[PDB]
Amino acid sequence: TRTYDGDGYKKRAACLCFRSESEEEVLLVSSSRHPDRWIVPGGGMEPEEEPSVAAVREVCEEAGVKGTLGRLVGIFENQERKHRTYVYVLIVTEVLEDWEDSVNIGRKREWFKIEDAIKVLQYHKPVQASYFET
Ligand SMILES: O=P(O)(O)O[C@@H]1[C@@H](OP(=O)(O)OP(=O)(O)O)[C@@H](OP(=O)(O)O)[C@@H](OP(=O)(O)O)[C@H](O)[C@H]1OP(=O)(O)O
Ligand SMILES: [Cl-]
Ligand SMILES: [Cl-]
Ligand SMILES: [F-]
Ligand SMILES: [Mg+2]
Ligand SMILES: [Mg+2]
Ligand SMILES: [Mg+2]
Numbered sequence: 001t002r003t004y005d006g007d008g009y010k011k012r013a014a015c016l017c018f019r020s021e022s023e024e025e026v027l028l029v030s031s032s033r034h035p036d037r038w039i040v041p042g043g044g045m046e047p048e049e050e051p052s053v054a055a056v057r058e059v060c061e062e063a064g065v066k067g068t069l070g071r072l073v074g075i076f077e078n079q080e081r082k083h084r085t086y087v088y089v090l091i092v093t094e095v096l097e098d099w100e101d102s103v104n105i106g107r108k109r110e111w112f113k114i115e116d117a118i119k120v121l122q123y124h125k126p127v128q129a130s131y132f133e134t
Pocket of ligand 6: 042
């Protein structure tokens with residue numbers, strides 16, 4: 001079940017899934033609609049679900065990783081798609097082989113240097129590119 005803020009924006013959460021504490025490489029996953037494109041893994045908060053809990057859950061489902069949850073980066077609106085995303089740091093400690101979306105929809109995942117992640121997100125996901133601005 002999808003959830004919404006008072007203004008009708010869909011509530012979402014995501015993590016910047018870093019390979020280490022140095023936050024130099026981040027994990028992106030393929031778009032479900034357009035598999036040749038990259039996105040930051042994240043998705044809808046469930047009813048009464050804490051955003052940090054939604055973030056870790058969606059990362060597990062879409063990217064097949066787990067780790068140590070870090071700081072809230074910020075809350076980011078996508079005015080065109082009418083959604084509002086809480087974005088957390090996650091330092092990846094486990095990479096699992098046969099994750100929900102791998103199995104279900106053949107979703108891919110790849111490590112990017114920060115500069116390269118920003119480059120591949122810019123065209124279709126400029127708000128997700130902005131996650132990395134600070
Ligand atoms: O699951 P939704 O329908 O609320 O939203 C997904 C939208 O889903 P969210 O991430 O906002 O929510 P869930 O991860 O909980 O499906 C997201 O889907 P996915 O999760 O499959 O990546 C979007 O795809 P993309 O960013 O991968 O191209 C998808 O277009 C978008 O579908 P829409 O209803 O906007 O047609
Ligand atoms: Cl890193
Ligand atoms: Cl977005
Ligand atoms: F989802
Ligand atoms: Mg999802
Ligand atoms: Mg999603
Ligand atoms: Mg979901």
